[PDB]
Amino acid sequence: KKGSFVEMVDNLRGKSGQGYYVEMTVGSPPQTLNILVDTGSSNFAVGAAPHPFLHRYYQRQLSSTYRDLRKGVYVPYTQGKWEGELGTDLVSIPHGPNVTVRANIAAITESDKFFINGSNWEGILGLAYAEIARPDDSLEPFFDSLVKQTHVPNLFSLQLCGGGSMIIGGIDHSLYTGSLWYTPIRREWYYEVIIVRVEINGQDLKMDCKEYNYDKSIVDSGTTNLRLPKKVFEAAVKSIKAASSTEKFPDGFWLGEQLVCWQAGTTPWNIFPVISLYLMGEVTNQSFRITILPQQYLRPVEDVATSQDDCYKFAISQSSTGTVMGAVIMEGFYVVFDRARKRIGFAVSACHVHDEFRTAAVEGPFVTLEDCGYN
Ligand SMILES: CC#Cc1cncc(-c2cccc([C@]3(C4CC4)N=C(C)C(N)=N3)c2)c1
DSSP, rough: TTTTTHTTOOOOEEEETTEEEEEEEEEETTEEEEEETTTOOOOOOEOOSSOOOOOOOOOOOOOTEEEEEEEEEEEOOSEEEEEEEEEEEEEOOTTSSSSSEEEEEEEEEEESSSSSTOOOOEEEEEEEEEGGGGGGGSOOOOHHHHHHHHHHSSSSEEOOOOOOEEEEEEOOOOEEEEEEEEOOOSSBBBEEEEEEEEETTTTTTTOOOGGGSSOOOEEEOOOSSEEHHHHHHHHHHHHHHHHHTTSSSOOOOOOOOSOOEEEETTTOGGSSSOHHHEEHHHHHHHEEEEOOOOOHHHOOOOOGGGEEEEEEEOEEEEESSSSEEOHHHHHTTEEEEEGGGGGEEEETTTTTTSSSSSEEEEEEEEEOOOOOOOO
C-alpha cells in the first residue's frame, strides 16, 4: 500500500509553534531528513553543514547522484538569513507518493537565526510557486518537478493538528467532514486569497474589505500566527478585549510577547469570542466563512517549568506585509491546495477544535450584493 492515501495519513510531526515537518530523503544512498512543510515559500533548502541547532544535515559528498549547479544563493529575511549553493539530487518522501524525482536543492552552508532550536527539522520544503523562488523564478520548485516527472496529480492537502497529514496528489475524504468550500487562488506566487468579511463573535468589523487584504492575504503553513494588517489587527484586538473584559491582560500579552497562564484545566475559553473570516467564493459575491475558536488563537506553550498551569501566547499579531493565515488558522481544518484548478479548499478537519459549546466550522454560502483585492 506504498503511496496510498492511507499510507500518507499521519506523516507529519511538530506543532504550530515550531513548524510541522515531513520525513524526506535526498541523495544516494538516501539521507533521511525532517523538512518543514512551508506553503509560504518556494525553495527546497536543506542544512548542508553542521550547526548548533541541527541534529543532522545533508552531506553532498556522500551522494553520488548530487549535481552542482555552480550557482550561489543568498536569502535574507526580516528575521535571520541563509546562504548556500544550488545543485540537484534525487528526492523522495518515504511516507508520501511512491516515487523518486530529481529536484533542485539549495545546500545551506551558512545561516543566521534561521534554524529553530528543538524544532527537530533540518530543512524547508517550499510549496508555493516559482515566482517567489530564490534567486529567481527560473529555479523550479519541488512540487513542479514532482508533477512534471511523475503521474502525481497537481494538488496536495494539509491536515494540521495540535502531527497531521500531508496528502499529495489527492483528497482523503477520511480526513474531513461536511463540505469542502473553495476560495480562488488570486495569483500564483504565494498561495494568495481574498478575505471579504471579518466578524468577531458575529459582529462585523465593518471595514472596507480591501483593508483585510492590504497588501495581500496568503495561506502559509510556515507561519505560526494569524497575522493581520495593522488597521485590522487593532480592530480585532479592541473587539477581543471587549469580549473578554471580565479579565484584563498585560499589553504584552496582546503584543504576543507574553504568556497568560491559568491553573491547569481552568482556561476560561468561554470569555474569548470566535473569529470568522469570510473568504471569496468561486462565484461572484458568494463567500463562505471559516470560524476560529480561542483554542486556536491562544497557542499553548508547553514548558515543564510552568506545568502546574496551562499557559498561552496570543497567536494573532500585526503585519506590515498583508494578512497571513498561518498554522493556528489551518489547524482543525482540512486545507486542499488544488493547484490544478487554482483554488484552495477548506473543510472541517477530523482533528478540529471544539468544546461542548462551540466548534470550528466551515459554512456557506453567504451572498453580498466591490472588489476586495489590492493591486
Ligand atoms: C507553523 C510554523 C512554523 C515555523 C516556526 N518557526 C519557524 C519557521 C520558519 C523558519 C525559517 C523560515 C521560515 C519562512 C521562510 C522561508 C520564508 N518564514 C516564513 C514566514 C515562512 N512561511 N517560511 C519559517 C516556521
